[PDB]
Amino acid sequence: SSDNMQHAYWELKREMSNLHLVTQVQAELLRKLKTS
Amino acid sequence: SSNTLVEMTLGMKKLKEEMEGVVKELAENNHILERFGSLTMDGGLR
């Protein structure tokens, strides 16, 4: 119904948070790599 | 607009699944970097 659209929307926003996080982990990782 | 709305719901479902796939691949890239990566003045594409 209208409810299932709200649920799909919520899950989509939820996944965006996971995308922000893995990107921030990658940023941190680049900062922490060995250099030479 | 129930025909356009059903496709919006399914569209949002598909986007979520695609995003999941990207997150998984970015995490795999991160794992490679965590184990083997370095930054060097003369690293890069050689």
Author numbering:
A (entry chain A): 215 to 250
B (entry chain B): 679 to 724
The authors write:
Analytical gel filtration chromatography and ITC-based assays revealed that NAP1 TBD can directly interact with the TBK1 CTD with a binding affinity KD value of ∼0.72 μM, which is roughly fourfold stronger than that of the OPTN/TBK1 complex. To further uncover the detailed interaction mode between TBK1 and NAP1, we also determined the high-resolution crystal structure of the NAP1 TBD/TBK1 CTD complex. As expected, the NAP1 TBD/TBK1 CTD complex structure consists of two NAP1 TBD and two TBK1 CTD molecules, which pack together to form a symmetrical hetero-tetramer. The hetero-tetrameric NAP1 TBD/TBK1 CTD complex mainly adopts a parallel and compact four-helix bundle architecture, which is capped by a short anti-parallel β-sheet formed by the C-terminal ends of two TBK1 CTD molecules. The overall structure of NAP1 TBD/TBK1 CTD complex is very similar to the four-helix bundle core region of OPTN/TBK1 complex. However, in contrast to its continuous helical structure in the OPTN/TBK1 complex, the C-terminal region (residues 715–717) of TBK1 CTD in the NAP1/TBK1 complex adopts a short β-strand, which directly augments with the β-strand of the counterpart CTD molecule in an anti-parallel manner. In addition, unlike the dimeric OPTN coiled-coil domains in the OPTN/TBK1 complex, there is no dimerization site between two NAP1 helices in the NAP1/TBK1 complex. Further detailed structure analysis showed that the interior of the NAP1/TBK1 complex is stabilized by nine layers of interacting amino-acid side chains that are mainly mediated by hydrophobic contacts and polar interactions. In particular, the hydrophobic side chain of NAP1 L247 buries in a hydrophobic pocket formed by the side chains of L711 and L717 residues from TBK1 to assemble the unique hydrophobic ninth layer, which is further stabilized by a pair of backbone hydrogen bonds formed between two S716 residues located in the anti-parallel β-sheet of TBK1.
